[PDB]
């Protein structure tokens, strides 16, 4: 419209309506110029390229992008509590993005005629980097101003070299809307249909589903011999009942497993050697090994053992102010998947045993351990939980086929996820005027809820803040103005029958 | 098909009209594999889940109709005409579903038999003989239920959700005959079982029933793999071998509960599915474990357990006259080929549970008020008739 | 039926990240302080551009059933008859059938064009395009932990020679 009139207002709140919630978040951002307006090839060779497993080839672009893909972008700690205590499920429905109050600076003075380019890729033609759990999200706390992350991508590599099949992308080849200080930008997005994330824990275990008072009518082999001696072979059949529940026939079996090595928080229980990389579980792709992280959804530890965690099997966040490299255990926050132990195998245990031979009169029975077990008919499992600090959605790769596309770091797998939103400063002149821009961003998401009808008589477990006194308030600022998240908050408190 | 079955039942008082905590420690403590925690209820329930209930000596269920009538409440023996029997169905599936565990207590196969209604109980989360804070307790009185005197009746109908037809055909062709030829499809998954011979001189002279058994571990507790993935019971021509925990074993009429001989039971065999499925005691196949070279021979290893691969096909387990019909699919984020492993039709919303108890009638109370709950009751039981009608669609 | 996929992927599954930006996730970098008895620690690093092998990923490559590797250069092969003895097979009703072609997997690692799976391919066509989402036919799917470590016992792993479907797998079919 003009210079002296605002192109948008400040919208931050939540609105709880019946079976849906509407989260609205506004932040202030600052966009510099990246690469001095240039598109530059990058490779491990530019960093030296130590290991083959780390080899990559790609391009940095002058463009930036917006990332709202973490839950603490859209939910306050109180709103997250109001969600996870009252609901069995939720999922995103609609998305509303706005960009307004443009200001462009020179180095400081206002530049009224400079522009800012912005577009979205809604046909999904660009490499999609929003599913990789990168930094650069919107700040959890609305009073924080954030820098916009640079957009860059990777393609096929051989060592640090490219191949004939590698693609190069010029984002200048995309039509975009150019904004001055009076223009604003918006679009609406419709989340494709995803299943509700299960915000609950089972009050039963897969192996306890039986009526404890009544026998089965099936028989199991109780004795293969009469007693001590020679030639005592026999076939005896007890019926499965309450007293021995381990042998009863069952219709459903626990889900798949890929075993993790366990590490103990008490450090003197760990082996005195380096096994972080060597003792890791991993998968191999075209010769390059990738750590299996976080991997298939499995229980972090057995009941009663809280000090053991799967090596790569858990999601680990950092505390406010924590460093980048080789920080102490206290500095980070290790989440656990203990809720899913009722239906999923423990990450650090074998799945079970299998017969490795034929017994005979001359040969004893032999059983081996199952270190990994892929999907079998009859399996049922739980997906990994989502956290307030964790990602929301991911992009399902475009492939011939997949199984259970739900992303392994948590969240809603989508073939058409929320599109990437690209932004850059239009250059004003290999000699350009030093320039940066700033403004506001508001995102609005409609969430659908699933209420619990549960008949449980005794009271549930809820998420609750500590009653006791402390120097600071949890999920608040300190005396220096630093906002911090004291702990990871999972979604699973309420219970369902199995 | 459409079947109709009517039976005569008797419902006692269970637990003296009382809810009780039960655990392995109340049963003596057992071991960790057998550890459990739960509750026993005064309520009973009806289970028609077995085929011989609905049938005398492709298909799938469609509709269900259930009636409860001719209620007679006895006191202990005289008639009590003023007494009610309470009954409800769990149609939101809010209670723990015990009907898919293959328990005894079915409608008897022979229509003239008069049977006892089994007592309802359930299990919850356990760390041992103990409970955790996540363990749930259910009061069935906190469910609305109809109350019936001797002239009242109870009926409801149910609609089976859409399920695939059960295959009741034997293939004339085998997957490999559709050795080194290229084939578009491969046999289904395997999880190996130990091979037991009904000729006792052939089997190893040692105890290996539990120790040599295939199992799966959950939260540190080992469960037997039973019956397990659906596989052929034996190779062609060998009829004396059966998987140790692989097949369904029924007892003959009058068979004892503990340590019966092999002539007292009926071992089912899956040998019809051997066209598309691997043998249970056989390995799935071989894989290369190395890279050959001028210095190294080609090496192979046996695949004991193999998960789903693209291009696999398999038959489910056969249903038997004495076998179960349906099971409830657990409510989870994910499952694969939910068809229950003991056989039958898997359903997210199976036929609902039908819960029944006798209303307690207190004995003579004291003539001065006391705040204790009443522990003194009239000895009382009920009896009546039950009809169940299922419409079976055939293929 | 779904469309056949004529195109090849210009990205590999493990490279889907933004190369310029760190993750907000940590991994276990260091278990021992170093060069002494009772040097035991937990140190955690951010996963990022410099170390891409440890980053958290949402999807994993598809299923594998390993084929024995054969070189089109005859002098590199072992001097023995391994056509049948070293072949990957599946058993049906006590009968052994070769696995041909088998699960769709990459014929060979990038840069080595002389190797082919013994019964893995259609005969000699190569699958090399699908190595972005699929494991190599002649390689293990990866490693798993075979033990609980402790102060006494070192950590142990083992190779996964065959790996069935897992949630979060993506794969390409064989090319027509």
């Amino acid at each position, epitope marked *: 419209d003009g210079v002296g009139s605002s192109s948008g207002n400040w919208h931050c709140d939540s609105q709880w309506l019946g079976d849906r919630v509407i989260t609205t978040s506004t932040r202030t951002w600052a966009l510099p110029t990246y690469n001095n307006h240039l598109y530059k090839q990058i490779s491990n060779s530019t960093s030296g390229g130590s290991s083959n497993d780390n080899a990559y080839f790609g391009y940095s672009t002058p463009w930036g992008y917006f990332d709202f893909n973490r839950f603490h972008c859209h939910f306050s700690p109180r709103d997250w509590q109001r969600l996870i205590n009252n609901n069995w499920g939720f999922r995103p429905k609609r998305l509303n993005f706005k960009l307004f109050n443009i200001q462009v600076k020179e180095v400081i003075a206002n530049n009224l005629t400079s522009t800012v380019q912005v577009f979205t890729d809604s046909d999904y033609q660009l490499p999609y980097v929003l599913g990789s759990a990168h930094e650069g999200c919107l700040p959890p706390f609305p009073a924080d101003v954030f820098m916009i992350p640079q957009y860059g991508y990777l393609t096929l590599n051989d060592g640090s070299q490219a191949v004939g099949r590698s693609s190069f992308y010029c984002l200048e080849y995309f039509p975009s809307q150019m904004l001055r200080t009076g223009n604003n930008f918006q679009f609406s997005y419709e989340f494709e249909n995803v299943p509700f994330h299960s915000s609950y824990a089972h009050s039963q275990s897969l192996d306890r589903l039986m009526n404890p008072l009544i026998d089965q009518y099936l028989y199991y082999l109780s004795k293969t011999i009469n007693g001590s001696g020679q030639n005592q072979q026999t076939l005896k059949f007890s019926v499965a009942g309450p007293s021995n529940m381990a042998v009863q026939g069952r219709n459903y079996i626990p889900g798949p497993s890929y075993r993790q090595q366990r590490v103990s928080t008490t450090v003197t229980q760990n082996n005195n050697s380096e096994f972080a990389w060597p003792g890791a579980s991993s998968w191999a792709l075209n010769g390059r090994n990738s750590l299996m992280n976080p991997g298939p959804a499995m229980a972090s530890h057995k009941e009663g053992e809280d000090r053991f965690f799967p090596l790569s099997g858990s999601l680990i966040f950092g505390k406010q102010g924590t460093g980048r490299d080789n920080v102490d255990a206290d*500095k980070v926050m290790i989440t656990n998947e203990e809720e899913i132990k009722t239906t999923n195998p423990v990450a650090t245990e074998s799945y079970g045993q299998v017969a490795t031979n034929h017994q005979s009169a001359q040969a004893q029975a032999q059983t081996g351990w199952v270190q990994n077990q892929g999907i079998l008919p009859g399996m049922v499992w739980q997906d990994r939980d989502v956290y307030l600090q964790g990602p929301i959605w991911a992009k399902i790769p475009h492939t011939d086929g997949n199984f259970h596309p739900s992303p392994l770091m948590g969240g809603f797998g989508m073939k058409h996820p929320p599109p990437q939103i690209l932004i850059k400063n239009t250059p004003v002149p290999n000699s350009f005027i030093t320039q940066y821009s700033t403004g506001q961003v508001s995102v609005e998401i409609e969430w659908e809820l699933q209420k619990e009808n549960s008949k449980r008589w005794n009271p549930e477990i809820q998420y609750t803040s500590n009653y006791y006194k402390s120097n600071n308030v949890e999920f608040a600022v300190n005396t220096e103005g630093v906002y911090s998240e004291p702990r990871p908050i999972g979604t699973r408190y309420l219970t369902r029958n199995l | 098909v459409i079947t109709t079955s009517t039976r005569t039942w008797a419902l006692p008082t269970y637990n003296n009209h009382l809810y009780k905590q039960i655990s392995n420690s109340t049963s003596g403590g057992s071991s960790n594999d057998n550890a459990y925690f739960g509750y026993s209820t005064p309520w009973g329930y009806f289970d028609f889940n077995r085929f011989h209930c609905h049938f005398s000596p492709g298909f799938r269920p469609k509709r269900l109709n259930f009636k409860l009538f001719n209620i007679q409440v006895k006191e202990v023996i005289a008639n009590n005409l003023t007494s009610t029997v309470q009954v409800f169905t769990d149609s939101d599936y809010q209670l723990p579903y015990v009907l898919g565990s293959a328990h005894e207590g079915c409608l008897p196969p022979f229509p003239a038999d008069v049977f006892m209604i089994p007592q309802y109980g359930y299990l919850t989360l356990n760390d041992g003989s103990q409970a955790v804070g996540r363990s749930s307790f259910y009061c069935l009185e906190y469910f609305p239920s109809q109350m019936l005197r001797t002239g009242n009746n109870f009926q409801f109908s149910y609609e089976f959700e859409n399920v695939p037809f059960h295959s009741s055909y034997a293939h004339s062709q085998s997957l490999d005959r559709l050795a080194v030829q290229g084939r578009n499809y491969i046999p289904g998954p395997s999880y190996r079982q130990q091979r037991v011979s009904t000729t006792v001189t052939q089997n190893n002279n040692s105890e290996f029933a539990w120790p040599g058994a295939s199992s799966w571990a959950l939260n540190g507790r080992n469960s037997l793999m039973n019956p397990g993935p659906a596989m052929a019971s034996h190779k062609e021509g060998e009829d004396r071998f059966f998987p140790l925990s692989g097949s369904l074993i029924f007892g003959k009429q009058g068979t004892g509960r503990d340590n019966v001989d092999a002539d007292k039971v009926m071992i089912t065999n899956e040998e019809e599915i051997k066209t598309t499925n691997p043998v249970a005691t056989e390995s799935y196949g071989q894989v290369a474990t190395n890279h050959q070279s001028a210095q190294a021979q080609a090496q192979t290893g046996w695949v004991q357990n193999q998960g789903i691969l693209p291009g696999m096909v398999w038959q489910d387990r056969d249903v038997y006259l004495q076998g179960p019909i349906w099971a409830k699919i657990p409510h989870t984020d994910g499952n694969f080929h939910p068809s229950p492993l003991m056989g039958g039709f898997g359903m997210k919303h199976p036929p609902p549970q039908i819960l029944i108890k006798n209303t307690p009638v207190p004995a003579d109370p004291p003539t001065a008020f006391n705040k204790d709950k009443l522990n003194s009751f009239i000895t009382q039981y009920s009896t009546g008739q039950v009809s169940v009608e299922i419409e079976w669609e055939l293929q | 039926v779904p469309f056949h996929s004529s195109y090849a992927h210009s990205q590999s599954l493990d490279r889907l990240m933004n190369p310029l930006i760190d993750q907000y996730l940590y991994y276990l970098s260091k278990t021992i302080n170093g060069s002494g008895q009772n040097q035991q620690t937990l140190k955690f690093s951010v996963a990022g551009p410099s170390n891409m092998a440890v980053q958290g990923r949402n999807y994993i490559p598809g299923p594998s059933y390993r084929q024995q590797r054969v070189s089109t250069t005859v002098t590199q092969n072992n001097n023995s008859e391994f056509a049948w003895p070293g072949a990957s097979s599946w058993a049906l009703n006590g009968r052994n059938s070769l696995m041909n072609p088998g699960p769709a997997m990459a014929s060979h690692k990038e840069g080595e064009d002389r190797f082919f799976p013994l019964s893995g391919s259609l005969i000699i066509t190569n699958e090399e395009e699908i190595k972005t989402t699929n494991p190599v036919a002649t390689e293990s799917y990866g490693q798993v932990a075979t033990n609980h470590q402790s102060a006494q016992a070192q950590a142990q792993t083992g190779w996964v020679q065959n790996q069935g479907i897992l949630p979060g797998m993506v794969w390409q079919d064989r090319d027509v």
Partner: antibody
Amino acid sequence: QVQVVESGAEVKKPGASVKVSCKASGYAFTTYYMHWVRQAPGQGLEWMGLINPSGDSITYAQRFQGRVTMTKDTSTSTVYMELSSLRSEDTAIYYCARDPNVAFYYGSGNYYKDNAMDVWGQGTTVTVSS
Amino acid sequence: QSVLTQPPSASGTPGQRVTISCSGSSSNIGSNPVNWYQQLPGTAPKLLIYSNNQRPSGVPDRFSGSKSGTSASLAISGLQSEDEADYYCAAWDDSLNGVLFGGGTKLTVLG
């Protein structure tokens, strides 16, 4: 082997300040927490303060706040405890304890770090007398 | 207002079972793990049980630890003369925001 060599016994008058040093050797100094706990001659144990593996974060018992100071020296692998404005009741033995539990567990309900100290120093007898 | 309390003394004869218990507030025993220390006269305390029931390496199987509600108990079985020492039950206390020790329980063998 792991050892925690406690400092020497001392005798102090009221108002004086006593510093007790704790020298660890045979393991990684940075990795573990260090606890200070005093025991009166006839009385049970009393927890005084805590210093984290990094040395940046320190917690004190409320009784001792403002009159106690703790510092950790990575160079010589020594932890120090400062007690000031001594009183007759202060006279005790001062133990230095190593804590092998590095991380917090974040389960349902409030989080916690296990504070069990496996290695204890021999102890130092500090008498406050005239 | 949050306290850890144990009986000042206990007694038993060798081979008998002896249980030592302490009572704690909701802030400490109720929400935090409980560890047990055994101290012989003239020597520093030795950890016996940690994380409620877990036992450290080099510690005899006879010692056992349990936590129920806001009360924690330590069980000693197959008692011997050597076992006689002062026993302390400890737990982190949230209100205090520090570690809190019980008063200690002096065990006395008989003979």
